[PDB]
Design an enzyme around this catalytic site. Structure first.
Site, short mmCIF file in Angstrom:
data_model
loop_
_atom_site.label_atom_id
_atom_site.label_comp_id
_atom_site.label_asym_id
_atom_site.label_seq_id
_atom_site.Cartn_x
_atom_site.Cartn_y
_atom_site.Cartn_z
CB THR A 106 65.92 26.91 73.10
OG1 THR A 106 66.17 26.82 74.27
CG2 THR A 106 65.88 25.53 72.73
N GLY A 139 66.24 27.18 79.72
CA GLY A 139 67.39 26.63 80.65
C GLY A 139 68.61 26.64 79.68
CG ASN A 178 54.35 25.98 80.44
OD1 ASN A 178 53.46 27.21 81.62
ND2 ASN A 178 55.21 26.32 80.03
CG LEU A 179 56.77 20.09 79.75
CD1 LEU A 179 56.59 19.28 80.59
CD2 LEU A 179 56.99 19.79 78.75
CB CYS A 180 57.43 25.21 81.81
SG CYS A 180 59.04 24.29 81.12
N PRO A 207 61.81 29.49 82.79
CG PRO A 207 61.51 26.70 81.74
CD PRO A 207 60.28 27.41 82.40
CD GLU A 265 56.36 29.47 80.77
OE1 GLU A 265 56.34 28.47 81.51
OE2 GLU A 265 55.83 29.78 80.07
N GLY A 309 56.87 21.25 73.97
CA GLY A 309 56.29 20.76 75.26
C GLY A 309 54.65 20.88 75.22
#
Ligand SMILES: Nc1ncnc2c1ncn2[C@@H]1O[C@H](COP(=O)(O)OP(=O)(O)OP(=O)(O)O)[C@@H](O)[C@H]1O
Ligand SMILES: Nc1ncnc2c1ncn2[C@@H]1O[C@H](COP(=O)(O)OP(=O)(O)OP(=O)(O)O)[C@@H](O)[C@H]1O
Ligand SMILES: Cc1cn([C@H]2C[C@H](O)[C@@H](COP(=O)(O)OP(=O)(O)OP(=O)(O)O)O2)c(=O)[nH]c1=O
Ligand SMILES: [Mg+2]
Ligand SMILES: [Mg+2]
Ligand SMILES: [Mn+2]
Ligand SMILES: [Mn+2]
Ligand SMILES: [Mn+2]
Ligand SMILES: [Mn+2]
Lengths: 683, 289, 289, 683
Positions: free
Chosen positions: D148, D577, D375-377, D575, D379, D193
């Site tokens: 993104t 999104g 990290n924030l996700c 992810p 991964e 993030g």
């Protein structure tokens, strides 16, 4: 319950309808013959005491190494020769609980009052035995009192910083906001109260690089600063105290004020950050004429003019802001804003009120910068230049962040010893030393301003104590005459000492040449108006002391023109909260809140009578809440005319009076030249 | 000044018994001694019996005599919590821990118990003595109600909180904690309604109402000490329970705007782990001097 | 045979007006004529009055006289809904749609409106006439309550439903539908309690009770006709509303176990369109696979 | 209601007992016939469009200036020659609502899908027209999707950074904490993030300058970070997202976890700060044996050993910490802590779980550092070195802060084109270009680690979509066989491209010589185990594509030994999104949550069936909640054995299962080699 506690509580048990004030003295004796002498740590001689305090990391060895042990022994003997006795139990209790040095486990007392005074004097003198003895005589006579940071931390290894208050300018950028948060945490770690000017930050709904309605305003920065001060809370000992100052013409001024409303939501409410409002004369003029005012978006003004809104005079630029279509503004009712200020001060005592034009019409360093905000106690009023903290790997443009060292003259002890000149000069020297030995490695603007401005704050305490113990009503014109003469003398001798230091060091403060001291304008009212007492009683009070006349002021003006001034700012009257107990003095130049104050310590309760309170001077010790606030404003303005910085002026209000009375008091203070208003304490 | 705020706090605390699964308590219940199980049962029955009086009489009688639509609504909500939520919750705890015959016997015992009856009937007596349009009798009943909500329940709450703080009977302890949280706000609210009446009285009448409140507190307190020894000596806890009673008595007094009666004491750490000035517009000529 | 299922239904229907955001009605409200807005405000104000008295007086007093802790819990819950939820929801609607002066005026209007005062006088009079241990006075008050729940509200409910059915004022309409859903079960429940008392009587006594119920219904009906004309003539709907109230009068009679009294009529089809997780400990076998 | 929305809602209307999936296609046509074409700005020629976009500050001049206009026109023509059509309404809606360039007034569409793809390709190629056409063919075939940030911002002047995953190390100092807050604010301003490691921070009740019980712990730092992330919220566009990671042996771990409890007070709970817990194998061993564990005070360990607690291997250090009297520790029950983690994940999905030893037993860069946090996700798993941010006017010691470059392969589109090698290599080249063009001037360690490590994350998506459209159940052994083969080929070609880039540029990543790539250990399991499909169906799926054998892996190992590897890290499965909508793909390698998802946009309802969903593959599109989480763990471990970094692994639980089931899934993930667990979504 302890014996001294019972003796102190025996004061309120009336005998023949009169308070037993003398019982207080007995309490001190008990407090020393049962607690202090038993809990003190005695050594064979001073050598063992000094060695134990040095090797155990209680004292810094550098300041003690400048004297031979014979000189230190002579200084300590000079301190103990006075045989100083605490006249009240609370004085000794406050010293030995807040300022006397204790062991690591805080089970024993290592420092007496004389020991603490000797250490502070030796630190002040910086290797001069005679100067150390002079400081010892000044402090043991209680003529001068160094501020709580200086008195508590001088010569200590585990000390913090000797500077009480710090003032930061926050530029309108994320880098500057983050740097301000970092510096606030660093200075609260050092123990000092931090004040931040948020007037340059753009308001809510402004553009961050062409995307509009993006900024959180000053409220988001306020929340960040509140969390920073909560986190940096002097290692959990004293709650982190911060102040935020906003100009009343800032668009966020309402939201700012809404941070202190008792009904504010958690996402807006800020609880550990004091708030202050800077009111130019334009706002008061608009409120007086009932003309609807305009609050402004700082970023639009900066884009249009290249300067910040608080960087220029609103009295001359307000109409240009209003008539400029490229400047964004919101309509407000200035009278409604004043009523909101009064309501907020009634509810919580906030905001601090800074009358910007009152500060800057007599400000001596307007060339460097106008005073745009005050400190956490709203008595420091100095020029500040904002810093440009740039990106990483880029050089930062370091400005000037205000910081001054506090020290208070005990008016009763100074006038009893007839030593206004000597006390003022020695206090100025001590504050100059405190400034010189202050080096803060995490606040660059504070360090640069300390090195350049060389600003100090010389306050005064026990004004009401001296007036009541001499049979002068605090609201009387005689009291204002005494304040006028005494503080003119203090200003004269402070200017003389500053010029003498500049002469002896060959250096003045930075940008002194553009100041009103260099041009001689500052001395105008002093070379045309005589400030000798107009009442015979006050003149008798000043007997034995040479009151400066217009000729002495002219000579001082010539001396300053020839040599300059070492200090940009010299006099600021701090609240002097807890150190006034040790000196047996009323807090600052404010009138006493109560004649006898009941304070709860541990599970016990103690009563502290005002210093010198008795039957003959009971009604001269009039409580502040019972006093006319207009006459207190008159007193504070009379003192303020001789103080270059501000005075922490707390308003003492009754519950019966309305917000209209508070607004009237504020407007009379503005009319009388009051620079700042500290608190609205309601009985 | 306060009813809408309490309305909000009350309705946002709404809960139902079904939300807490109780069956997992049997995994710690089985490991308690007979004296521990006996004390718990007796305490629980004590709380149940007192709370029923509050649901059937205490809250509805106060709601009846208090003037004001919004106050009546808050009081109705509190009465609902007693009858619809708390009473069902106590029943659920009992049915989980004891068989039917044991429940019936414990209630028979506690129903005949001298110390439980003394306090239950003292409180109920004051509710029955309220007279229409007599604010003095209403105040006395409110004092009784605050003493029940903020003080009398706590000799009982002690034990579930004591277990809850140790990791025992966690499901029923969670339920008790929710109940206790409701009774706390009930006590504070009724306390404010009592202070409103108190503040409308003369100085002599105030002194007389203070004497009433302290005298009542003393009677209840002396019976609580006996109640406490009767239940807690067999599990060795009475000393600490007594400290908890006094601490909560002080809270009840503060709810009624009165000074604390007892010296401050520290509480058992296991139980702890379980637990406007008048706006006047500027008139102009205030800017000129 | 029924209280437990009513208890469960009542508590599972629990709601608060704040769950429904009302700012969505702002435009369809703005667009109504002055006559329509006036009738709407007044209609909801009449409803507010009825719920105020049902919550303050009707439900608590019936709860006091009905025996059994579970029956009392249901009635207490219903009482709370009346004044803490229903009556308050109308203020949420008023505060969204109307300025303070219009709100003040409509509450002044309820105080001086003769039909609204008459219906309150009649219903509350019967509530306050209940005598302890006198089942006949209780029956009479329960008939009055059923008539309030299942008949009297409906001259008011018509208008929010009429708008909801046209896709107008749908958020306010959602609140009203929730209120109506509650009153329907309240009317059935109180109806069943009334039938219990009626069924205990001799045939002669029953004949008198039917006379009481029918005389009361007719008296309330005649007053409601005048109220309906007073409110609805300015919006042209009086005849339609009258058909609706007759329809609901029959439902009230049926809730009381009586035959319908009014003949069936076609109702406006618009109005018809208006209608923590469980915790297990870790075993040593859960660490191996 | 618009016509396309009615056509989309007609899907749920069942005809002959079947969903009208084909109606969705019609909706797309309507969405383009009624809305997109009407509101799309058209120009007479591409030259005018490019001039308008560049002049109006939509695009950047630098990347377009590298090509002649003929080359740019050829790239755009190559993009438009595909005649790409969105197969579902939600794909086009998500692209034209989230990624398509709009005017400043947000009412007109300046960029189509082909325009955005052409611009991103031209940015990727950096002046190579043929490479730009290759990128255009890659993205218009929808084989590869830039993340993104990259997809939205590439080639746009008004843009954030192309990297949105940032990992920060916070050292145990006030200067480092303030710098971490500043860097978090700056990176959230860029739109990224930010994940912060708080394990080095000393716990609550530790000493600051040898004064006891002074530290506020990591919870105060979390409050500061939460305020910073709330303040920095992408100029008021998205909610500021941050993550905090703490080692489970840190003493604050409970208070850390207590920040996510609903019962937590306002001064304890952090709302916009995600939390993750790092669980070493020692904690799992202690819980398994039911031995009581110890949570340690980090500062005492640092004082005793000179290294931080999270910087050493707890497996060999735990006994020494426990037996050391100078290390302060608190007794805990590890099984109770695991149950608390499961309960918190049931309530809120927090914390993220990092199995430290599972990450570090296959980590190729343990010599640089062990992976201490994610990290924030959850991964990104890379080596990080903490930075020593000193006082002002003092040189900082800049460490390594992780910031990897995201991009996802569309497994369905990649495998149907039989272009695993070409897509992987082109995606690696694009990720390398974006990493090289990233320059963050306010995060020194992030910039240094981006320059040195050159780490990129190449992910995959549409795994469940591809498996369901090929008649393969996600939990079937055939699905795991396909994942094994496909991701082994992805790893092979990613390593080959990294080595080719290293050979071409003549440089590897910093400290590559100590990595397992240089020593050849990384290729061990690849030179001994054959990863060819074991099922005939999967082999037929891979028909037409060369599957690397053990000999090919030996050749790649020799090539890496001779030439090195350019990227320290290459593969991480994010992810994905919203880009999964535009690509008409299932999100990440996760199984689908719903077969048809219902969404509410504005006041309208919309329906998105999973890509390729029909009556024939309705059963193969099994929902994630209905699946056995053990088999999902098995598939994720099968993929993870070929991914150097982690995989965003969300658990999908039913409301019926308890915390014991959640703990069992976590322990089976730890047993199966799962590196990170992202979320516990309860249906
Ligand atoms: N008010 C006080 N302030 C300070 N120190 C005190 C005070 N009262 C007692 N002390 C300390 O306790 C000691 C007790 O001695 P005290 O004042 O009773 O008289 P002493 O034994 O005759 O000697 P001296 O007064 O000469 O010190 C003092 O010497 C002094 O050190
Ligand atoms: N499903 C779709 N996805 C993407 N764009 C679409 C879609 N449907 C229509 N469009 C857009 O609308 C235009 C009209 O397409 P249509 O289905 O009417 O026929 P066409 O033969 O593709 O038309 P054209 O002459 O525009 O190429 C397409 O060229 C395209 O720009
Ligand atoms: C980044 C950011 C800034 N701001 C506000 C606070 C600052 O006072 C103000 C300036 O931010 P800057 O750091 O100056 O942002 P910028 O330099 O990129 O934008 P510009 O060129 O317009 O200066 O923006 C927020 O309110 N929230 C945010 O997240
Ligand atoms: Mg800027
Ligand atoms: Mg340090
Ligand atoms: Mn209860
Ligand atoms: Mn209660
Ligand atoms: Mn109702
Ligand atoms: Mn009802």
């Amino acid at each position: 319950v302890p014996k001294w506690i019972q003796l102190n509580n025996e004061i309120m048990i009336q005998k023949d309808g009169k308070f037993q004030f003398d019982k207080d003295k007995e309490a001190v004796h008990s407090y020393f013959v049962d607690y202090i002498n038993q809990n003190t740590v005695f050594f064979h001689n001073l050598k063992e005491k000094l060695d134990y305090l040095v090797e155990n990391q209680y004292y810094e060895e550098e300041f003690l190494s400048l004297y031979s042990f014979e000189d230190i022994k002579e200084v300590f003997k000079t301190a103990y020769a006075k045989k100083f006795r605490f006249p009240s139990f609370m004085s000794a209790f406050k010293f030995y609980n807040d300022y006397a040095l204790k062991t690591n486990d805080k089970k024993k007392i290592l420092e007496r009052y004389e020991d603490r005074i000797s250490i502070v004097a030796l630190f002040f003198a910086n290797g001069d035995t005679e100067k150390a003895k002079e400081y010892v005589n000044l402090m043991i006579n209680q003529e001068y009192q160094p501020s709580t940071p200086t008195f508590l931390n001088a010569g200590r290894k585990r000390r913090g910083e000797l500077v009480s208050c710090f003032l930061l300018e926050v530029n309108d950028s994320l880098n500057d906001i983050s740097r301000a948060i970092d510096i606030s945490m660093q200075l609260s770690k050092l123990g000092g109260g931090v004040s931040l000017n948020l007037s340059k930050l753009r308001a809510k709904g402004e553009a961050i690089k062409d995307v509009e309605n993006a900024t959180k305003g000053v409220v988001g920065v306020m929340k960040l600063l509140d969390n920073a001060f909560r986190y940096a809370d002097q290692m959990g000992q004293r709650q982190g105290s911060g102040a935020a100052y906003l100009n009343i013409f800032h668009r966020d001024i309402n939201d700012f004020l809404d941070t202190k409303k008792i009904s504010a939501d958690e996402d807006v409410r800020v609880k550990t950050l004091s708030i202050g409002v800077v009111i130019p004369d334009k706002f008061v003029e608009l409120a007086r004429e009932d003309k609807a005012a305009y609050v402004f978006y700082p970023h639009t003004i900066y884009k249009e003019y290249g300067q910040h809104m608080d960087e220029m005079d609103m009295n001359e630029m307000y109409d240009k802001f209003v008539d400029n279509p490229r400047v964004k503004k919101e309509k407000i009712n200035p009278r409604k804003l004043l009523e909101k200020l009064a309501m907020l001060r009634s509810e919580s005592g906030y905001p601090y009120i800074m009358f910007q034009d009152n500060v800057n019409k007599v400000h001596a360093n307007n060339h460097i910068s106008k005073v745009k905000f005050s400190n956490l106690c709203s008595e420091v009023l100095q020029a500040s230049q904002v810093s440009s903290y740039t990106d990483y790997d880029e050089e930062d443009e370091i400005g000037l962040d205000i910081s001054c060292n506090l020290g208070s003259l005990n008016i009763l002890n100074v006038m009893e010893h007839k030593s206004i000149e000597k006390t003022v000069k020695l206090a100025t020297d001590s504050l100059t030393h405190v400034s010189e030995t202050t080096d803060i490695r995490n606040a660059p603007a504070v360090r640069r301003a300390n090195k350049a401005m060389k600003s100090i704050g010389l306050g005064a305490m026990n004004l009401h104590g001296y007036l009541a113990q001499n049979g002068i009503a605090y609201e009387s014109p005689e009291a204002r005459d005494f304040a006028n003469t005494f503080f003119m003398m203090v200003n004269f001798y402070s200017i003389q000492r500053s010029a003498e230091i500049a002469k002896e060091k060959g250096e003045t403060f930075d940008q002194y040449e553009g100041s009103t001291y260099a041009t001689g304008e500052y001395f105008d009212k002093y070379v045309s108006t005589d400030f000798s007492p107009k009442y015979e009683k006050i003149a008798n009070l000043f007997e034995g002391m040479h009151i400066p006349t217009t000729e002495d002021w002219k000579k001082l003006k010539a001396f300053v023109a020839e040599h300059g001034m070492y200090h940009s700012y010299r006099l600021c009257i701090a609240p002097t909260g807890s150190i006034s107990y040790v000196q047996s003095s009323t807090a600052s130049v404010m009138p006493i809140m109560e004649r006898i104050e009941e304070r709860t310590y541990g599970n016990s309760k103690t009563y502290y009578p005002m210093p010198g309170l008795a039957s003959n001077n009971w009604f001269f010790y009039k409580e502040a809440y019972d006093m006319d606030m207009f006459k207190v404003v008159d007193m504070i303005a009379t003192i303020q005319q001789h103080i270059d910085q501000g005075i922490s002026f707390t308003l003492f209000l009754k519950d019966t009076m309305t917000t209209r009375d508070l607004n009237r008091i504020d407007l009379y203070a503005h009319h009388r030249g009051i620079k700042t208003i500290y608190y609205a304490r309601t009985k | 000044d306060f009813t809408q705020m309490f309305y909000n706090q009350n309705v946002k605390q709404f809960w139902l018994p079904e939300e807490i699964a109780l069956n997992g308590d049997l995994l710690t219940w089985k490991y308690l001694g007979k004296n521990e199980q006996d004390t718990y049962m007796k305490v629980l029955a004590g709380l149940t019996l007192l709370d029923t009086e509050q649901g059937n009489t205490g809250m509805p009688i106060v709601a009846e005599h208090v003037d004001g639509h919004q106050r009546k609504a808050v009081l109705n909500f509190m009465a609902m919590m007693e009858n619809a939520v708390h009473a069902k919750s106590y029943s659920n705890i009992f049915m989980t821990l004891a068989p039917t015959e044991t429940i019936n016997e414990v209630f028979e015992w506690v129903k005949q118990n001298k110390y439980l009856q003394k306090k239950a009937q003292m409180i109920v007596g004051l509710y029955k003595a309220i007279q229409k349009d007599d604010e003095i009798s209403l105040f006395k009943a409110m004092v009784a109600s605050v003493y029940l909500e903020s003080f009398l329940f706590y000799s009982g709450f002690y034990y579930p909180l004591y277990f809850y703080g140790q990791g025992k009977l966690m499901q029923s302890g969670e339920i008790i904690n929710l109940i206790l949280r409701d009774e706390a706000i009930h006590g504070v609210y009724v306390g404010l309604l009592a202070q409103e009446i108190y503040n409308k009285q003369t100085e002599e009448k105030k002194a007389e109402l203070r004497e009433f409140a302290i005298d009542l507190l003393n009677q209840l307190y002396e019976n609580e000490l006996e109640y406490t020894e009767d239940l807690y000596d067999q599990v060795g806890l009475s000393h600490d329970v007594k400290k908890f009673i006094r601490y909560n008595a002080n809270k009840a007094l503060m709810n009624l705007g009165f000074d604390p009666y007892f010296e401050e004491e520290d509480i058992n750490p296991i139980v702890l782990n379980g637990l406007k000035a008048t706006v006047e517009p500027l008139k102009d000529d205030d800017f000129y001097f």
